[PDB]
Amino acid sequence: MQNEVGDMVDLYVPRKCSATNRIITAKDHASVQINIGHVDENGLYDGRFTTFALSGFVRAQGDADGSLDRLWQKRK
């Protein structure tokens, strides 16, 4: 990461699985990036969604469903 001068030297700070916090490599093709839209009122949609990242490990476990369930129990 941050050089001692002010620059940041690494490339594409990777994203992390939201269920396991393992970072998803650049060849983890079993990784998904779900998008869950928000309903508001009459109309029940606008271009406003929450986003989740799931790794190949998490999906192959079979707990990828449970992770989405217990993370989409988040409230705002």
Partner 1 sequence: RALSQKEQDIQMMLAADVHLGTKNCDFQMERYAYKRRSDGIYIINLGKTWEKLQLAARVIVAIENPQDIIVQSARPYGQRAVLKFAQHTGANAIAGRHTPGTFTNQMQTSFSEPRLLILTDPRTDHQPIKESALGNIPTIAFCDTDSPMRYVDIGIPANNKGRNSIGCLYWLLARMVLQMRGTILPGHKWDVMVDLFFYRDP
Partner 2 sequence: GRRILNDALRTMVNAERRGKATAQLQPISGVMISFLNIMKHRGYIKNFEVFDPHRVGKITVELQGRIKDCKALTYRQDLRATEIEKYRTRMLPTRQWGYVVVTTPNGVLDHEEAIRQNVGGQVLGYFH
Partner 3 sequence: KWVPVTKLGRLVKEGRFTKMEEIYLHSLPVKEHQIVETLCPGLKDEVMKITPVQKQTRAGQRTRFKAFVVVGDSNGHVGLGVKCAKEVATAIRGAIILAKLSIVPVRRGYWGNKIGLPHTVPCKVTGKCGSVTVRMVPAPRGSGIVAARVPKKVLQFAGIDDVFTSSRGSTKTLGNFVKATFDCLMKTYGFLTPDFWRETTFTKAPYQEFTDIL
Partner RNA sequence: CUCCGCCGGCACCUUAUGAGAAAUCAAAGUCUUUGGGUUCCGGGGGGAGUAUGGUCGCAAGGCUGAAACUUAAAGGAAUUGA
Size of the site for RNA (CB under 7 A): 4
Burial 45-56 (b: 16+ CB within 10 A, else e): eeeeeeebbbbb
For residue 37, CA distances in Å to 10, 68, 69, 75 come to 32, 14, 15, 13
Q: x/- site string to RNA, residues 38 to 57, per CB under 7 A?
A: ------------------xx
Q: How far is the CB of 35 from partner 1 (least distance, A)?
A: 4
| Residue found by looking up tokens 């029940």 in the block | 44
Point out which residues bind partner 2 (CB under 8 A). Answer: 19-22, 57-58, 61, 63
Point out which residues bind partner 3 (CB under 8 A). Answer: 1-5, 9-16, 21-29, 31, 33, 35, 51, 53
